[PDB]
Design a protein around this ligand. Structure first.
Ligand SMILES: [Cl-]
Ligand SMILES: [Cl-]
Lengths: 8, 150, 150, 8
């Protein structure tokens, strides 16, 4: 989801 | 502000609790997110901190963690002198407040790069410790302790 | 063996995974218990480590964490050079194995003082880092880094 | 439980 911790 | 003195501090965001330990002489910090402040959570955080830096004294953040037998057991195990957190020096009170406001400012600036608060808090620990104000807090803490060892 | 070089290491106990970071030049360690070794867990652990010490290079523990784009994203965020873990020097494999053996020995020695494995592992981090062999690993890491800053 | 982390 475009987060460092959730690239998804 | 000897090399071994640290202060605990508990602040809240997003309905969660951020527990912070501050090395008083340098302003270097370690922090974690927990769902609420209990003596068991506080005790485990101090066991973590004292395995990583030479923690001689901790001023606890409130009277419940000062009284907690779980926190006193961890400070016994790790060789820490557990102390109260009374700001006999009123500057103490103000320094902690403005650190909570700086960390919260940093968390806001990173908050959209992380799904979970705990990532944003560790981003904020990294930015705080590396900020040059000149040396950073991570530099000051190593200097202070190395000087003490020598 | 520069001041900023760390090695990751993953070992197993009690059906759980212990992830360890080793500062190569001193033997100082940080470690945590996680249910399994994923790129998201390894990435978060490296973000924690790099906010607390000046981590320039990490030799990853296996090729899945070297390939992981989540681990690469964290090493980008925190300014770490992510490297492979190939023991071009075979003394490497050996040093790591005997550290895992030492930690597991310590964990056994404390295991009955803790309900949860995570407490035992942090007790073992504390005993490893404070053991004199004469200076301790926690003394060596501060000396090395302070020498670097100066 | 007579443990550091569970004094019960
Ligand atoms: Cl709370
Ligand atoms: Cl695994």
């Amino acid at each position: 989801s475009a987060k460092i911790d959730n690239l998804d | 502000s000897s090399p071994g003195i640290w202060q605990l501090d508990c602040t809240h965001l997003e309905g969660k609790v951020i527990l912070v330990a501050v090395h008083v002489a340098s302003g270097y910090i370690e922090a974690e997110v927990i769902p609420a402040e209990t003596g068991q959570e506080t005790a485990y955080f101090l066991l973590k901190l004292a395995g990583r830096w030479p923690v001689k004294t901790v001023h606890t953040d409130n009277g419940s963690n000062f009284t907690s037998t779980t926190v006193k057991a961890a400070c016994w195990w790790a060789g820490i002198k557990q102390e109260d957190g009374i700001p006999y020096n009123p500057q103490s009170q103000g320094v902690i407040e403005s650190m909570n406001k700086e960390l919260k400012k940093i968390i806001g600036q990173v908050r959209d790069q992380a799904e979970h608060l705990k990532t944003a808090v560790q981003m904020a620990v990294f930015i705080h410790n590396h900020k040059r104000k000149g040396y950073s807090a991570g530099e000051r803490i190593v200097d202070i302790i190395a000087t003490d060892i020598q």
